[PDB]
Amino acid sequence: QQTLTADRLASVMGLDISMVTQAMVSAGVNQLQCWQDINTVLQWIDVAS
Amino acid sequence: PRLVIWLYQVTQWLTEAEITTEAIWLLCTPEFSGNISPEISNLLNNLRP
């Protein structure tokens, strides 16, 4: 479905909510629709770390 | 000091019992996804008849 939220993903994967929100803002994605958005967010998070 | 002793005792127990902090968090957290899971759907489908 399209009910995945940033907070749920951050809690599940063990990241910090602030980092996930900032990565989502930077990557230009506002909704986690497909795997591409998640991949982009994770790439931004990894580069930042 | 009570909080410090509690943290020390809990961490020692977790290290001795070979349980990661994430596992204990999943065991004792009060938060939940709030979305019905495929396991629950299968349980309901098998239980209704």
Side-chain angles (χ1 to χ4, degrees), chain A residues 1 3 8 11-14, chain B residues 22 25 31-33 35-36:
Chain A
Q1 317 153 246
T3 43
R8 189 46 195 177
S11 90
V12 155
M13 247 172 53
Chain B
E22 175 80 310
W25 159 257
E31 311 176 351
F32 54 90
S33 89
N35 162 274
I36 218 161

Side-chain angles (χ1 to χ4, degrees), chain A residues 5-46:
Chain A
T5 62
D7 316 74
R8 189 46 195 177
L9 168 79
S11 90
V12 155
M13 247 172 53
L15 304 166
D16 177 31
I17 172 62
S18 293
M19 225 174 204
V20 170
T21 288
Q22 288 203 357
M24 284 200 13
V25 169
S26 302
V29 287
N30 38 46
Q31 201 69 227
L32 304 187
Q33 308 268 262
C34 50
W35 158 250
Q36 301 306 307
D37 313 349
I38 294 176
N39 180 34
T40 303
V41 162
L42 295 202
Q43 288 195 33
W44 275 90
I45 289 272
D46 158 77

